Design a protein around this ligand. Structure first.
Ligand SMILES: Cc1cc2c(cc1C)N(C[C@H](O)[C@H](O)[C@H](O)COP(=O)(O)OP(=O)(O)OC[C@H]1O[C@@H](n3cnc4c(N)ncnc43)[C@H](O)[C@@H]1O)c1[nH]c(=O)[nH]c(=O)c1N2
Ligand SMILES: CC(C)=CCC/C(C)=C/CC/C(C)=C/CC/C(C)=C/COP(=O)(O)OP(=O)(O)O
Ligand SMILES: CC(C)=CCC/C(C)=C/CC/C(C)=C/CC/C(C)=C/COP(=O)(O)OP(=O)(O)O
Length: 452
């Protein structure tokens, strides 16, 4: 079999993969990125295609340009179950042509030196002497099995985790997710008969009956084109998602013409804290494969780019120390946790609370303004539910006569700050990962119990 040697092998060319390749380019390294999909189809996984503007600024990534930007976004409208209360949150963002932008990022990284092979699949992890040292690839372009060696493998295979799942089960980097720590989501993109009111605003509909554990959304991709879909918490016993979709479509999008459908289909999306470690001997995991999705609103394309940034940073460190062990790549964790991980950990706890609320809990909480329209912005910008804000909210649900889960919002706010306290104190060395993880597990075990 043919053999090749590279410094870095990036498996998967999604938002996470292309972010790693872009950031690692022009640094004196020999890089190979692969993706099973053909070039023109790379990055077309079922998505809402809605990404925050703040993400692009931070990392110094290319702004959506021209055809890549389908519709400019200025904010979000959060509708209550009975729809008697509409929260308008001002937050700038983009509704983009996801495959078109993704391929541009790849096209540029290719110009900056990175090599990209489409129609190529990582089939077997090369794992010898206790290290990930590359992979066996199948290039369907030339029907050839090639063996690629690398000092560091970047796992960016998405929610499938098709590569790292084939690693031995004692590696912390093969951590699996529980069914209930993920949501199945489905979406379609159709044209509307009439225009779209406030088309520069995203619409999110909370409703535990029409989308239990998640929500419905109405994302305008233009003047007369809309990305409508929903998400539901998995591992609960809920019926097929396309049954929820078919039953309640007209309720959230009656203006669409069902004959002008462009794309459909759905996929899995994780709604939890990131992998306890995203780095191990000779391997870094990023994107959906490392559970980098926001547990509350389910956005994952912004925080995927962050994981890719932190991956380049960690790898450049490892090569400067010739150390590709977990310890040598460990800065991947310290970086991502400070950037988005600690925020996720706190929101993981908050998600567990929000998913358990009745429609009456949300109808009451929103109508009575249990929190500001700007404090919901802060609670998911920094992932913090301030002890002073919970107190202002707790004295509003005091005027509630019926029993509710709302009365535990204070204890939830304390548990959120507690687990974020832990993630700020992330292990300095891999020697502490085990001890620190079980403590995190204890925090979640206790909190899960406190909701009952
Ligand atoms: C229905 C729905 C709706 C939304 C979203 C998800 C879902 C399911 N998300 C989440 C978002 O889609 C997701 O979090 C990011 O795309 C994660 O990026 P990745 O690159 O990790 O995934 P992605 O799945 O794009 O990465 C996998 C890539 O690697 C390739 N690959 C996998 N295994 C391979 C192998 N063994 N060999 C070679 N190639 C391999 C695949 O072909 C693919 O190109 C979202 N996000 C957001 O922020 N805003 C939104 O509006 C939404 N809405
Ligand atoms: C588990 C919970 C509580 C929610 C998950 C619900 C689902 C399925 C979320 C993923 C589907 C989706 C439309 C994600 C994108 C939502 C979003 C707000 C993305 C970012 O938009 P911005 O423009 O940054 O604001
Ligand atoms: C009640 C339930 C289940 C969800 C409510 C939460 C929702 C859907 C919306 C409010 C949060 C939101 C979308 C805020 C704006 C976007 C945001 C938090 C951050 C900007 O981008 P990041 O992806 O977090 O980085």
């Amino acid at each position: 079999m043919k053999e090749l040697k590279y410094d870095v092998l990036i498996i998967g060319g999604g938002f996470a993969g292309s972010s790693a390749a872009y950031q690692l380019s022009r640094r004196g390294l020999k890089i190979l990125l692969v993706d099973s999909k053909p070039w023109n189809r790379i990055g077309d996984k079922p998505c809402g295609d809605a990404v925050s503007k703040a993400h692009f600024d931070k990392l110094g990534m290319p702004y959506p340009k021209g055809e890549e930007l389908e519709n400019k976004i200025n904010g979000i409208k959060l509708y209550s179950p009975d729809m008697q209360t509409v929260w308008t949150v001002n937050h700038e963002g983009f509704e983009l042509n996801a495959p078109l932008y993704n391929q541009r990022v790849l096209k540029e990284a290719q110009d900056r030196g990175v090599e990209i092979w489409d129609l190529t699949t990582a089939m077997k992890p090369i794992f010898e002497d206790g290290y990930v040292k590359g992979a066996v690839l199948f290039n369907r372009r030339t029907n050839e099995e090639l063996t690629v060696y690398s000092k560091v493998v970047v796992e960016a295979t998405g929610y499938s985790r098709s590569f790292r799942s084939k690693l031995p089960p004692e590696l912390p980097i093969t951590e699996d997710l529980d069914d209930k720590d993920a949501d199945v989501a489905y979406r379609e993109v159709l044209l509307t008969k009439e225009d779209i009111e406030d088309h520069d605003y995203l619409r999110i509909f909370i409703d535990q009956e029409t989308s239990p554990g998640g929500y419905w959304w109405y994302f305008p991709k233009g003047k007369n084109k809309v990305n409508v879909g929903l998400g539901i918490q998995g591992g609960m016993g809920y019926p097929s998602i396309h049954e929820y979709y078919k039953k309640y479509l007209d309720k959230y999008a009656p203006d669409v013409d069902k004959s002008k459908l462009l794309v459909k289909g759905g996929a899995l999306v994780p709604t939890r804290r990131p992998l306890y470690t995203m780095a191990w001997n000779g391997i870094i995991v990023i994107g959906d494969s490392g559970f980098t999705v926001n547990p509350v609103h389910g956005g994952g394309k912004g925080s995927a780019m962050i994981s890719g940034y932190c991956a380049a940073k960690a790898i450049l460190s490892a090569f400067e120390t010739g150390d590709f062990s977990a310890s040598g790549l460990w800065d991947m964790n310290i970086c991502y946790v400070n950037e988005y991980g600690a925020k996720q950990a706190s929101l993981d706890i908050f998600r567990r609370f929000l998913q358990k609320l009745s429609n009456d809990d949300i109808n009451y909480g929103m109508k009575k303004k249990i929190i500001k329209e700007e404090d919901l912005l802060e609670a998911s910008e920094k992932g913090d539910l301030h002890l002073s804000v919970a107190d202002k909210a707790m004295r509003v649900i005091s005027g509630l006569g019926r029993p509710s889960l709302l009365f535990k919002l204070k204890a939830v706010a304390e548990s959120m700050k507690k687990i974020k306290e832990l993630y700020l104190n992330y292990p300095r060395s891999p020697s502490s990962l085990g001890s620190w993880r079980r403590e995190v597990d204890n925090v979640l075990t206790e909190f899960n119990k406190s909701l009952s």
